[PDB]
Amino acid sequence: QITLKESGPTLVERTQTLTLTCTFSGFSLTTDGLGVGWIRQPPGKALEWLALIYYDDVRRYRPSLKSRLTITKDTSKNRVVLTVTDMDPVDAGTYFCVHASLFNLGSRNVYFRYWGQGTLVSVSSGVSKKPSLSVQPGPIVAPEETLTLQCGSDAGYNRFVLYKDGERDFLQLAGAQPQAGLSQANFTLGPVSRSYGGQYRCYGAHNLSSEWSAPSDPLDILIAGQFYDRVSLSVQPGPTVASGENVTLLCQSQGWMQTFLLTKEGAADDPWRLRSTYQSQKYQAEFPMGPVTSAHAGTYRCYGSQSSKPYLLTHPSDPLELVVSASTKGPSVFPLAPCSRSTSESTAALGCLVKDYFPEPVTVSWNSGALTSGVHTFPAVLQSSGLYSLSSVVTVPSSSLGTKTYTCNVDHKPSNTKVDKRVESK
Amino acid sequence: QITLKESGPTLVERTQTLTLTCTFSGFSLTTDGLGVGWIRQPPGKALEWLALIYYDDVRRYRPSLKSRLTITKDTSKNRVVLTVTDMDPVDAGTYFCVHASLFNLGSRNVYFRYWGQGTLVSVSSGVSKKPSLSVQPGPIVAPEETLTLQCGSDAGYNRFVLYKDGERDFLQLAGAQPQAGLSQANFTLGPVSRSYGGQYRCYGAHNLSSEWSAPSDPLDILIAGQFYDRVSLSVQPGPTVASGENVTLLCQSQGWMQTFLLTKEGAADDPWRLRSTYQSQKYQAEFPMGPVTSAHAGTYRCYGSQSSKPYLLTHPSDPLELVVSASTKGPSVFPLAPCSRSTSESTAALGCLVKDYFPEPVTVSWNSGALTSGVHTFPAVLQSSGLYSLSSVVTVPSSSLGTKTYTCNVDHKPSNTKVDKRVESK
Amino acid sequence: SYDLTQPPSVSVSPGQTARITCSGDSLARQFASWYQQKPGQSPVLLIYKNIERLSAIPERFSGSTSGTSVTLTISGVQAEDEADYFCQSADDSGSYSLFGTGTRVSVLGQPKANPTVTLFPPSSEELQANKATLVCLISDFYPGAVTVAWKADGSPVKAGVETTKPSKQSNNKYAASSYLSLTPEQWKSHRSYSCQVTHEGSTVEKTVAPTECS
Amino acid sequence: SYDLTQPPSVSVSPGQTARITCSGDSLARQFASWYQQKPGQSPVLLIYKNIERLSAIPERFSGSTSGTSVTLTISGVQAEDEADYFCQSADDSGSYSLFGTGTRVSVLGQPKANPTVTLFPPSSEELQANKATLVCLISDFYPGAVTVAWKADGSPVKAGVETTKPSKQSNNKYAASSYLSLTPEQWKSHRSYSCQVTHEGSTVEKTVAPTECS
Amino acid sequence: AARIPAAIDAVIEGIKSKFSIDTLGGEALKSVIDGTNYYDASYITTAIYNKFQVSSCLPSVPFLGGPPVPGAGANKPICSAVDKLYLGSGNFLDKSSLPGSIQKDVAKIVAGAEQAAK
Amino acid sequence: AARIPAAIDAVIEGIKSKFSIDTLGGEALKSVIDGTNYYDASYITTAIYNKFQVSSCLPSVPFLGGPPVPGAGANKPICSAVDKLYLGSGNFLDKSSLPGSIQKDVAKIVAGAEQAAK
Numbered sequence A, B: 001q002i003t004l005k006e007s008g009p010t011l012v013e014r015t016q017t018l019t020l021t022c023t024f025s026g027f028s029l030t031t032d033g034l035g036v037g038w039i040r041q042p043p044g045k046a047l048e049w050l051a052l053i054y055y056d057d058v059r060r061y062r063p064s065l066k067s068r069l070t071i072t073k074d075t076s077k078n079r080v081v082l083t084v085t086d087m088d089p090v091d092a093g094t095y096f097c098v099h100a101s102l103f104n105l106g107s108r109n110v111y112f113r114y115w116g117q118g119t120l121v122s123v124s125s126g127v128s129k130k131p132s133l134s135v136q137p138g139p140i141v142a143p144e145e146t147l148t149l150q151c152g153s154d155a156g157y158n159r160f161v162l163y164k165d166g167e168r169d170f171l172q173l174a175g176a177q178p179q180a181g182l183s184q185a186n187f188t189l190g191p192v193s194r195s196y197g198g199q200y201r202c203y204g205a206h207n208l209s210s211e212w213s214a215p216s217d218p219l220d221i222l223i224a225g226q227f228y229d230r231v232s233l234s235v236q237p238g239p240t241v242a243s244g245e246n247v248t249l250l251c252q253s254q255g256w257m258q259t260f261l262l263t264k265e266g267a268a269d270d271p272w273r274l275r276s277t278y279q280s281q282k283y284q285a286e287f288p289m290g291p292v293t294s295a296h297a298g299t300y301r302c303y304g305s306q307s308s309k310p311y312l313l314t315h316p317s318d319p320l321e322l323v324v325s326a327s328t329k330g331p332s333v334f335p336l337a338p339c340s341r342s343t344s345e346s347t348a349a350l351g352c353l354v355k356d357y358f359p360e361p362v363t364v365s366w367n368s369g370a371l372t373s374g375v376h377t378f379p380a381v382l383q384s385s386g387l388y389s390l391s392s393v394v395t396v397p398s399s400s401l402g403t404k405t406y407t408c409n410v411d412h413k414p415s416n417t418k419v420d421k422r423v424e425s426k
Numbered sequence C, D: 001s002y003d004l005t006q007p008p009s010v011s012v013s014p015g016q017t018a019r020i021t022c023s024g025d026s027l028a029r030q031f032a033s034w035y036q037q038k039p040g041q042s043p044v045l046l047i048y049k050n051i052e053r054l055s056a057i058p059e060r061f062s063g064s065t066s067g068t069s070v071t072l073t074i075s076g077v078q079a080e081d082e083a084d085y086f087c088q089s090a091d092d093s094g095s096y097s098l099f100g101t102g103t104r105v106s107v108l109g110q111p112k113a114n115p116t117v118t119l120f121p122p123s124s125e126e127l128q129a130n131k132a133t134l135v136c137l138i139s140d141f142y143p144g145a146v147t148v149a150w151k152a153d154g155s156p157v158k159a160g161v162e163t164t165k166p167s168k169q170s171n172n173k174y175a176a177s178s179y180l181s182l183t184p185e186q187w188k189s190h191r192s193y194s195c196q197v198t199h200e201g202s203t204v205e206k207t208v209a210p211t212e213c214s
Numbered sequence E, F: 001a002a003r004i005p006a007a008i009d010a011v012i013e014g015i016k017s018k019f020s021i022d023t024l025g026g027e028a029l030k031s032v033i034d035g036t037n038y039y040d041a042s043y044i045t046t047a048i049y050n051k052f053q054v055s056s057c058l059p060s061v062p063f064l065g066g067p068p069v070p071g072a073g074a075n076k077p078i079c080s081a082v083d084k085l086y087l088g089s090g091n092f093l094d095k096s097s098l099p100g101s102i103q104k105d106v107a108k109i110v111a112g113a114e115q116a117a118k
């Protein structure tokens, strides 16, 4: 009735000790040729041995972990204690308690017969003292709209405070519940005006009598529509662009403008900035977008800003949707052959490779609608260029390759192309 | 003339924040398209990107380290400050401060052009790893010699203190300079006597004014020669064995000893310990060594013990040297031919194989000392079973294959065997 | 000797013996034992020596030794033998113990079918268009897990290989293809190119030589 | 973490050309650049935007793009170009930057040589003696690092393989050998056995079959 | 004038109970909360807000920037009481919102006490 | 008899130099020394061992079988001087050896005044 029963903490903070204990009933550790030990198993991976103590007070530890592990043994109480010291979050997994027995007195090599059950051990990933300050919908705001800053943290903070740069007194103070250790607060800005722009920064604390944490990353809020001058957005290529040709959006203004912001209407990374260089009769600054792809699609708005007050803006320019489409291409049929010699093989393979086609449906049938004896048309591989390719192979009796004439027809409907190729082996 | 000069703390504790400070001269961050960032390189490993700040208020962090980084700029006085918050002994390397430049707008991909010089950063290991205590020559000593316990550590401890349980104050204290990776003290005990038995353990610390580490595992020092009666050792088979036979050392004596030890000279491994059974008016313990190989070679000596005095052993027994070596077998030659004489080759690969033989020198010579050219003899192969193997091949021309006899003659003086085998081509 | 290597996975249809090998340098002079860990349970010992077996374990599991590797033979695999099988040994000197990576015996449905790979060299018409592609076609295999490896004169090539995922056929046997993109100068330099396919356990190789059969 | 993979190491004799390729799933849309780090010093930019070199870099270095991989070729590598080479690129979204593992180009003192592998079937008189052993002999290779990997019927075999370390030879090129021990029934069971030799990446293979000769 | 002792006792009772006012603070208020001024709530609100230095509870910074640090009311019971009372789960409090909330609560307590004595 | 100022001056300089003794604390030895006991360095060793509290430098365990903790006056300069002098690469320090090494080092300082005076 030899059984092992292990128990201990099942959730330990990072860089802290673990104190699993094993209580064994059914055998006495004072008898010769016995031993208890601990064996780990990460979820899914293979087992790994950690510690072992024999009847005589001899301890073995896995050499990669000899510094951290430590096993202590008590005979009368029938208990063994494992005390792994530093617990990084890659040590999670089931921990078994085993009953090792020696083979012979020649070498301290053992086989684990009676295993335990195992206690799941989980290690906290780690906390971030810095709060995160994010704004919805976006850093660009209308002159009359109610913003909502989201100062959030995952360090169990009970209350947050919001500071605007350049002011000595805190703007607002809020609180939140440590819901499973994650906290979030939503400061509401009322009707915005010219003076609400700036660099908002939020802190955190455990309670009003504690010390405040490190400042969050500064967030910029820009007010739009303060100036009088209007800006216009003009794209040098056509509004519709085939993929590859490098778009160059251009911003023009009739006034003395310094910096031009260009924002993508959808949720994007961040607005761009550039300095305005005087041109023929207008201040302008062009953004080279480089080789466009399907990602740079959407609505683009070009603002205007001046460094007299760097957080102000002009009115948004007229939206300019940028549409990208992959042009259809005609398949090219190349003929692939077994090779010059396929001697002594009863059935040989002949085939057509259709290379570079973009609308996806292509259809290959050998010798019109006949030769349906084995035509297999393989599925198509989407090449990184963005053009698909597909192949088909017809198994044929060998002597026939000399006389029977096998040829293949491709039908790519969207590009209105029908190509036939007469494949042969020579 | 773009230069960047990093400067910051080099040595830092295990839970403190690093604050590097780049300083760049030649370019200003207010220029469009630029950027400044930090790159980390652990000792002898690949580069890792850490943080980057563009010509803007935008900061990009490594996704897996976003929680413990903070990059800031000061354009008025050119400098960039990076702060890692929770460094571990794995976050040590040579941090670089690098220039940057955008390829083109529409994708924040950059190429770092003007790098900076190295900036070595090292983190001191905390007091969590325990020292390892080891003793030479062996844990059991006669009551006349001196012992040198060795305390080693893999964390860079500067001072070591040795504690013997049963005493109130520290037995000895010593320090060792922290060599590149390891440090080791060499506590020297005096001339031993009866009262040096017990469990010695040693701690560690970075200086004599800091928290000491976790205790080392106890080391048992046993002193022999404090009991009147003697013990004798003998082996059931003959002392000479054929490397594959059951061998069972026996310890037999008068007197009431309830614990026997068996030690092998030249090995620092822990002694074996067994209890005794009263058979035929003699206290004896039986040590089954199981199958024996060349490793279990040397001299074995027995020791008695009693439980009233845990760390006192009877006087050492007479040595009984055990010699283990395999028996001479003599070679068994075997012909080998490629069995596929392709006509499209000029040289064949005729050869002969020597399969099993224990004594190391064997020589192969072809046609009785002739054909000295074109013959190759590969080195011996030590099989798992303990018998060597050989091979020799000769490259002869395709035309020579035919009515040209080829035969390899081998010898093994320790077995007095000469065998000649003719390698006829198939 | 710090690693005891095992196959990553072994699959066998019912009624056929499955062989699991545990190769390591330290197996020469130390004993071994074999463990079975069914999902969501505790590992159960099977055989505790090179050859001898516990009493309760059925007659199917028998072990054998050969040189520096020990092997298990699950004779007559049944549906209740789907688990992970581990291996144990010690260091060379007799010391700190070791555990193998551990296989995973899995029972199949339809019988295993080996792939049939056909390799086609670029046509003579390829080179006029300043293009050259090698096409490797794999069909009629089961289950759907393949990994193609393109080698040029043995040395691995990973510049231009494009592989599709396996797809179902009408016969419930998967099929997949692989295409290599080559400039005409490269194809006229190396001696031979090979398309190696590795099934669950296999390595089927096809070779094409630009200078020989073109 | 990082998705860009590189060969662990590349060795080349002086005067030849060395090719380094790093591949990933983000090289399709985002550019790449190549860095050179001599031991101890700071890395230096070599090639940016996949095609262009700096104005103060030797003409030997050149680069090119092949789909989802970029290759840097050091034509006529001299003794100075012994360093580590890293390629960097953004992720899919183009926000973060990822470096590569980085190779290590090393120039050999003596010109490289390829192994000459000859494999021998068991003798026709060994089947009478109920013991069968294949022999694989490797000769005249430099530097000495070979990993024999026996394969039977296309599946790996590790039960019986015994190999020696490469040893010095009378000529200044190393040598080694490897032996496989088989039961005669196993020898006559399978259809093809193949010794496989790996030497500085390149792989050579020689095959024999029981049906050709028993 | 029998209502005057009752009104004074009731209002000081309410203020002491709600804000955990110190015992000496009760007599300090009784020195000022004298029946001349129990009619209005703004006067007593400001009197509390300046006598018990509630304005010190909220954090402040030494420099123009610099991380905020807790004020002089680090451990005074009044600061803890107002913190636990207003800053709950989803309640905001700026400089110009605390006096209003205190006015509301104090007025409610005084009105309730007066009309319950009535 | 102009060497009796020299005898104490040399030793009070040497003790400060060797053991990094604070200037305001060096003269305490003068009260416990005179013109006949400065020849023997063991008196100086006893005075240092008694007043400067060198016993507090060494580690001490709170209760038997417990982890060592640094002594009381660990941060005092005398502990740093002992650590830098007697410890280091290839040195040992027993409980009894420390007074012995201190006395051996003070002997040379004592002999210095006799050699220099003449």
Ligand SMILES: *[C@@H]1O[C@H](CO)[C@@H](O[C@@H]2O[C@H](CO)[C@@H](O)[C@H](O)[C@H]2NC(C)=O)[C@H](O)[C@H]1NC(C)=O
Pocket (backbone or CB within 6 Å): A176, A177, A184, A185, A186, E089, E090
């Ligand atoms: C602050 O953040 C958001 C503001 O909308 C709130 O979270 C949303 O509301 C529900 C109900 O509370 C949450 O369960 C969801 O996470 C959100 N719903 C969505 C996004 O549709 C949140 O409650 C606000 N208040 C607090 C105290 O966190």
Ligand SMILES: *[C@@H]1O[C@H](CO)[C@@H](O[C@@H]2O[C@H](CO)[C@@H](O)[C@H](O)[C@H]2NC(C)=O)[C@H](O)[C@H]1NC(C)=O
Pocket (backbone or CB within 6 Å): A245, A246, A248, A286, A288, A290, A291
């Ligand atoms: C994409 O096309 C645009 C078309 O203007 C190119 O833009 C200029 O290219 C020249 C070429 O040397 C550069 O000197 C200029 O700096 C580019 N920008 C401007 C505003 O003139 C661009 O180079 C093209 N990119 C590629 C990769 O072909």
Ligand SMILES: *[C@@H]1O[C@H](CO)[C@@H](O[C@@H]2O[C@H](CO)[C@@H](O)[C@H](O)[C@H]2NC(C)=O)[C@H](O)[C@H]1NC(C)=O
Pocket (backbone or CB within 6 Å): B150, B176, B184, B185, B186, F090
């Ligand atoms: C501590 O003792 C060990 C063990 O002796 C020393 O390591 C070796 O010591 C022997 C002589 O005692 C030398 O011949 C070896 O060269 C030493 N090994 C190495 C790698 O140097 C060790 O040097 C001693 N350390 C100190 C500080 O005394």
Ligand SMILES: *[C@@H]1O[C@H](CO)[C@@H](O[C@@H]2O[C@H](CO)[C@@H](O)[C@H](O)[C@H]2NC(C)=O)[C@H](O)[C@H]1NC(C)=O
Pocket (backbone or CB within 6 Å): B246, B247, B248, B286, B288, B290, B291
């Ligand atoms: C080698 O010989 C020894 C000596 O007899 C064997 O040890 C005995 O093994 C049997 C096996 O059934 C046990 O019942 C005995 O109790 C063992 N003897 C002692 C004293 O314990 C050993 O088993 C033999 N080894 C092999 C592989 O046969």
Ligand SMILES: *[C@@H]1O[C@H](CO)[C@@H](O)[C@H](O)[C@H]1NC(C)=O
Pocket (backbone or CB within 6 Å): A206, A207, A209, A210, E080
């Ligand atoms: C506030 O948090 C600190 C830090 O955890 C704690 O010491 C204190 O007891 C808490 N409560 C108050 C009222 O300060």
Ligand SMILES: *[C@@H]1O[C@H](CO)[C@@H](O)[C@H](O)[C@H]1NC(C)=O
Pocket (backbone or CB within 6 Å): B206, B207, B208, B209, B210, F080
């Ligand atoms: C001893 O080490 C600790 C931790 O490394 C350090 O804080 C302390 O200052 C050191 N002692 C002295 C005298 O510097």
